[PDB]
Design a protein around this nucleic acid. Structure first.
Lengths: 232, 232, 232, 232
RNA sequence: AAAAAAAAAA
RNA sequence: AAAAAAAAAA
RNA sequence: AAAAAAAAAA
RNA sequence: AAAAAAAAAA
């Protein structure tokens, strides 16, 4: 005879503000900060995710490359739905924070630095779709998970990519719902949806225009194989 | 060389009577009883279910919010098919018992109490389908699992919802069979099916008339997204 | 550095002869034997199977109801492909042995015994398809797994049922291959297939003629539900 | 609070050269070597694979039949992506090494030896598709996994089989990508694809011409069953 | 079989 | 990426 | 619900 | 391969 207890659940709205959260991540973390830390984070980010989901423990500090950043492991499933606080980091919260932090550099800084950084940061989700750095800073960066916290700065690319994928059938449409709960230049989506449909409609156009060749196999092996029936 | 034994299985019919069972749950349990206990039970009822299926042990007592009610854990799989007795409670047996017990209050009581209760009880399965309290007491309550033990009091809403879902394709039709074994005003289904087809046919109409907007995403994000192709 | 060894594999044909095997099961086992042992075996045979697949150990003796019969547990997966010998019993080998042993009684014996036995033995796979004892001894018995070891005595019902299911789409066609390796009145299938196609074709007819109403739900709930769209 | 570290990842190309690798496997291993070792390897190769994926440890030495050969267990999943070196063996690397090593014998040697070997080696993947030794040495051998390391010696049969399967729908097309990264007579695939399309196109023809009867069931049971509707 | 096991609010 | 992981005879 | 969990470079 | 592993009554 074991005793299990449950408690009422309150009803309010969400307090976690991506803007505070980022401005609160900027000082507390990234004292150093190396582009080589971000580079590590992002190219091993799929590995980084698989570990945290194996490990059953819910504060994990990660060292990459020499940069120590501790992330509430909400991946490890069950998480277990242990609330992150509004001042909490997550592999996801972290990804987009960095994604925005890079774009603030890409804008703020000089040209010679802009050339060292684009040589240093790589986006495994972008460049799988053959989407490269010269396709624009905001668009490359918008492939990083968590860039949907910042449709503001990312010019509704994270959402447009999102539409474009669900549309072409390359992504289930569940993966679009976190995003539609978002905000754009301080506007809730019950308003930006009505009153901003263009930029959205406009960003989808740019995104539609891109390469988008899936790089499961080489360009030369694609055509070759097609001459046989196989399009992959 | 291990020895495993099996015993014959007898042939009779089912003795568990929802009416006795409820009238036997009314006194033994709910001395207090708070609407705040029921509220706890129902909004955490999905959690409550996931625990009992993790825990391997077959009498579990649950405390919600301060109300202690012990439930043969038939969820924990294998249950293991350890018979519940006719005087036994189950997450399911319990759900519908409460579901009926609320409706007895909704009927029995005053108007000012009827307004405090509807403010206090929430039905996560109803209100996911945007089905609200003002859609009628019996209909809201009929979304609670186990309301199919009481097609009598629930006016064949639990079954009509059931048809409507299987029909629209929103539910597999296996989930309709426990229900068709049921009884209606003391009548076995080999009779109520023949001789009651209207009320059934009648309740499906009411149910068909309802909102039924799936709330995976906001109303404003639905229309927005549709302008792009995505209906979700 | 661990060392793992593998050995050549020889090439001959199969030595296990259902006829010897049965005639060797008849004396060694069933000294008693009760119809109440067989009844136990067959109605709990689905349970009996689920145990043996949980238990990791490969000689298991089962007691039903008071009859002790030890069965190389090839179910427990991996079995593990530990060869059964030609004098070995298996839940499957056992099922059909009994299936044939009953039919030898059904034939050999008197009428008053024939009425006690048909009242005592139940076939959970037959009677799910509403196929009953009066549909003929061979046909009812041919639903028992392992009756395909004896197409001879079972008059190519085990195979005809098999065709009929694959055909109607009620069974995957993998489940027909063990059977086509079989023999019929001493004839290998490369011969009975050519030269016996009628009886086969003939038994399918009988089998086609049967009830075959799937009893997932009552007959009265089927028609009722159909009046709504749902055929199950 | 646990600390997990990740390190940058470099960018170059692949150094593992099937030609060196084979010529480095030829002396270091196969001092003896028996056709009876290869025979063991290949007919138990499916078993051999299932063990290595159960065992969690990453250097495994295998003894077959008396031939000891140690293979970095990359099967055991996660492998775990512990790099094999260019001088490393793998169940796969090993399979094709042997596959080529047999073909070097089939070519190098006399006729009476060529008749003992074809009697001794069996290819479980070939002969499931009823593809036999007399269908040519290169074609039989090209069914062995890892023969795609040597499109050179195997006359683009490993790839043609590959096309033919993806085409007929008998294989997912993911399983064609390792192969398209390969090389042919010293030529990278961005060149052999352009400039060799015939031999490829030519080898597909030969492969298309073959039996390819799936031997899930006997030839006599196929026709028999078809007379009933069932083609398997 | 009036028996026991998926969908679960803002 | 000339890297590493499904289909396996009578 | 501005909450938390799939697709991941050469 | 006459070999061994899904559907299981009221």
């Amino acid at each position: 005879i074991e005793l299990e207890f449950h408690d009422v659940a309150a009803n309010t709205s969400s307090t976690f503000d991506p803007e505070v959260a980022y401005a609160n991540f900027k000082r507390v973390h990234t004292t150093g900060l190396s582009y080589d830390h971000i580079r590590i984070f992002y190219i091993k980010g799929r590995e980084i995710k698989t570990s945290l989901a194996k490990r059953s423990e819910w504060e994990v500090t990660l060292n990459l490359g020499g940069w120590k950043i501790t992330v509430y492991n909400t991946n490890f499933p069950g998480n277990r739905n242990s609330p992150v606080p509004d001042d909490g980091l997550t592999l996801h919260r972290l990804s987009g924070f960095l994604a925005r932090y890079l774009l603030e550099k890409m804008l703020k800084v000089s040209e010679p630095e802009k050339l060292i950084i684009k040589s240093k940061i790589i986006n495994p989700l972008a460049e799988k779709n053959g989407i490269t750095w010269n396709d624009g800073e905001e668009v490359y960066l918008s492939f990083f998970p968590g860039s949907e916290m910042f449709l503001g700065t990312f010019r509704f690319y994270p959402l447009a990519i999102g539409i474009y994928k669900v549309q072409r059938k390359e992504m289930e449409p569940k993966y679009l719902e976190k995003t539609m709960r978002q905000r754009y230049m301080g506007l809730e989506a019950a308003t930006w949806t009505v009153s901003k449909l263009t930029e959205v409609q406009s960003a989808l156009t740019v995104v539609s225009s891109l390469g988008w060749k899936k790089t499961n196999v080489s360009a030369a092996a694609r055509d070759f194989l097609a001459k046989f029936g196989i399009n992959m």
